[PDB]
Design an enzyme around this catalytic site. Structure first.
Site, short mmCIF file in Angstrom:
data_model
loop_
_atom_site.label_atom_id
_atom_site.label_comp_id
_atom_site.label_asym_id
_atom_site.label_seq_id
_atom_site.Cartn_x
_atom_site.Cartn_y
_atom_site.Cartn_z
N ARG A 19 0.73 -1.27 0.07
CA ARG A 19 -0.12 -0.11 0.04
C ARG A 19 0.87 1.31 -0.04
O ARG A 19 0.31 2.25 -0.05
CB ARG A 19 -0.92 0.04 1.23
N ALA A 21 3.14 4.67 -0.34
CA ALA A 21 3.43 5.75 -1.36
C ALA A 21 2.33 6.41 -2.20
O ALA A 21 1.45 7.07 -2.07
CB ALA A 21 5.08 5.61 -2.12
N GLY A 23 0.41 4.64 -4.71
CA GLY A 23 -0.40 3.54 -5.23
C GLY A 23 -0.75 2.31 -4.15
O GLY A 23 -0.05 2.44 -3.17
N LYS A 38 -1.17 -2.08 -10.12
CA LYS A 38 -0.91 -0.84 -9.05
C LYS A 38 -1.73 0.24 -9.47
O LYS A 38 -1.67 0.74 -10.68
CB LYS A 38 0.58 -0.41 -9.27
CG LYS A 38 0.88 0.49 -8.76
CD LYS A 38 2.28 1.26 -9.19
CE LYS A 38 2.73 2.66 -8.54
NZ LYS A 38 3.67 3.28 -8.96
N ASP A 126 17.18 2.09 -6.90
CA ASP A 126 16.36 1.92 -5.91
C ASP A 126 16.42 0.12 -5.85
O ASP A 126 15.24 -0.37 -5.52
CB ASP A 126 15.16 2.34 -5.76
CG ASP A 126 14.29 2.20 -4.47
OD1 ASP A 126 15.04 2.35 -3.39
OD2 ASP A 126 13.07 2.08 -4.41
C1 LIG Z 1 4.94 -5.27 -2.51
C2 LIG Z 1 5.01 -5.54 -3.87
C3 LIG Z 1 5.89 -4.80 -4.80
O1 LIG Z 1 5.21 -7.20 -4.24
C4 LIG Z 1 4.68 -8.13 -3.94
C5 LIG Z 1 4.67 -8.70 -2.65
C6 LIG Z 1 3.97 -9.71 -2.55
C7 LIG Z 1 3.71 -10.52 -1.32
O2 LIG Z 1 4.89 -10.37 -0.41
N1 LIG Z 1 2.73 -11.45 -1.01
C8 LIG Z 1 2.00 -11.58 0.23
C9 LIG Z 1 0.75 -12.40 0.10
N2 LIG Z 1 1.28 -13.72 -0.15
C10 LIG Z 1 -0.11 -14.53 -0.24
C11 LIG Z 1 1.79 -13.83 -1.42
C12 LIG Z 1 3.22 -12.98 -1.39
C13 LIG Z 1 3.12 -10.35 -3.73
C14 LIG Z 1 3.09 -9.71 -4.83
C15 LIG Z 1 3.72 -8.49 -5.07
N3 LIG Z 1 3.80 -7.84 -6.26
C16 LIG Z 1 3.87 -8.38 -7.47
O3 LIG Z 1 3.54 -9.36 -7.74
C17 LIG Z 1 4.14 -7.22 -8.50
C18 LIG Z 1 4.47 -7.69 -9.96
S1 LIG Z 1 4.69 -6.22 -10.82
C19 LIG Z 1 4.57 -5.37 -9.40
C20 LIG Z 1 4.81 -3.76 -9.33
C21 LIG Z 1 4.52 -3.15 -8.46
C22 LIG Z 1 4.60 -1.60 -8.25
C23 LIG Z 1 5.34 -1.00 -9.25
C24 LIG Z 1 5.58 -1.71 -10.39
N4 LIG Z 1 6.47 -1.28 -11.31
C25 LIG Z 1 7.71 -1.36 -11.80
O4 LIG Z 1 8.00 -2.49 -11.85
N5 LIG Z 1 8.31 -0.45 -12.64
C26 LIG Z 1 9.28 -0.51 -13.51
C27 LIG Z 1 10.21 -1.30 -13.40
C28 LIG Z 1 11.32 -1.50 -14.03
C29 LIG Z 1 11.82 -0.25 -14.82
C30 LIG Z 1 10.86 0.83 -14.78
C31 LIG Z 1 9.71 0.82 -13.92
C32 LIG Z 1 5.48 -3.25 -10.29
N6 LIG Z 1 4.40 -5.98 -8.40
#
Ligand SMILES: CC(C)Oc1cc(C(=O)N2CCN(C)CC2)ccc1NC(=O)c1csc(-c2cccc(NC(=O)Nc3ccccc3)c2)n1
Length: 298
Positions: A19, A21, A23, A38, A126
């Site tokens: 949650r 910053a 988004g 997001k 980062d």
């Molecule tokens: C806490 C979050 C981060 O990370 C995650 C943590 C969990 C987690 O800890 N859980 C808790 C619940 N259990 C049941 C399962 C495990 C799950 C999924 C994600 N996120 C993702 O799957 C994901 C895929 S893309 C993405 C994301 C989110 C925000 C922004 C971006 N943006 C970028 O990647 N931008 C970018 C990348 C490279 C170059 C330029 C821009 C991707 N998140």
């Protein structure tokens, strides 16, 4: 960079998984596929453009965007953040030197891609395990960028910040380059090898860690760590960015070390009861490395 236009009707939101910053990241479903979304206007144009330009296995995949409500749609990481695999809630999974080396190889390959983009290179600035995601039973790693902070109070000078992995020149206010990501990578290598939070010894607010790193504090050296891994690690820590290796060079070096680190394709399935004892002991075990090394060099 082609991209799918998505009607919000097609999404079915399952749960919230972050949650902070600018988004709220959420699990969802879309045309069968499990997806991460997001929700948010300003920098979104720059991110959406960047996130469509990238095409690499170790950087997260963008399926597309829904323009109302304005949100990104990307592949879901079943394995979750590396931070959560390393230091999350119990039971934490067991992992090996081969896993640790593979995750750092994969991260470096993603970052080498970002630095090689034209006309201008993308600097991540980062890199830390919260922005490294795992899939395929923990075997595969994908770089993302949540961007966890903004306000100094409840973000940048706290545990939801990133000062442990930050290069001195960045928080110093000096000019920086893509070599700032190499410093971060050096810290992540130490972190996966030891399964310790970097500068957990110091702690307090983040300015304490920044102060120590600016004076020249680094993570403690690791007992019984192979000399080539220690050379590569400690070069990335260098105060001068000129003395740090390129990500291109890291990828080559690491690619060739994997000969001495078989079994990275084994998914994370066994549990672990982890507890922490100048120098520090590694979580992983380098015995088979030395064994395989001897056979080649003897
Ligand atoms: C806490 C979050 C981060 O990370 C995650 C943590 C969990 C987690 O800890 N859980 C808790 C619940 N259990 C049941 C399962 C495990 C799950 C999924 C994600 N996120 C993702 O799957 C994901 C895929 S893309 C993405 C994301 C989110 C925000 C922004 C971006 N943006 C970028 O990647 N931008 C970018 C990348 C490279 C170059 C330029 C821009 C991707 N998140």
């Amino acid at each position: 960079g082609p991209l799918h236009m998505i009607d919000y009707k097609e999404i079915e939101v399952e749960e919230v998984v972050g949650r902070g910053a600018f988004g709220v990241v959420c699990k969802a479903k879309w045309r069968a596929k499990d997806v991460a979304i997001k929700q948010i206007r300003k920098a979104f144009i720059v991110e959406l453009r960047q996130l469509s330009r990238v095409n690499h296995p170790n950087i997260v995949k963008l399926y597309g965007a829904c323009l109302n409500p304005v949100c990104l749609v990307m592949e879901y990481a079943e394995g979750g953040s590396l931070y959560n695999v390393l230091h999350g809630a119990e039971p934490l999974p067991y992992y090996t030197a081969a896993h640790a080396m593979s995750w750092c190889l994969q991260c470096s390959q993603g970052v080498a891609y970002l630095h090689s983009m034209q006309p201008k290179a993308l600097i991540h600035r980062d890199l830390k395990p919260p922005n490294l995601l795992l899939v395929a039973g923990g075997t595969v790693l994908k770089i993302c960028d949540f961007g966890t902070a903004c306000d100094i109070q409840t973000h940048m000078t706290n545990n939801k910040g990133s000062a442990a992995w930050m290069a001195p020149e960045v928080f110093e206010g000096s000019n920086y380059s893509e070599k700032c990501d190499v410093f971060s990578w050096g810290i992540i290598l130490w972190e996966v090898i030891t399964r310790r939070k970097p500068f957990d010894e110091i702690g307090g607010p983040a300015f304490r860690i920044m102060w120590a790193v600016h004076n020249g504090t680094r993570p403690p050296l690791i007992k019984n760590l192979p000399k080539p891994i220690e050379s590569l690690m400690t070069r990335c820590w260098s105060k001068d960015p000129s003395q740090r290796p390129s990500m291109e060079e890291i990828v080559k070096i690491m690619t060739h070390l994997m000969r001495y680190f078989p079994g990275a394709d084994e998914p994370l399935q066994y549990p672990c009861q982890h507890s922490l004892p100048g120098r520090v002991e590694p979580y992983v075990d380098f015995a088979e490395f030395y064994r395989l090394w001897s056979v080649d060099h003897g």
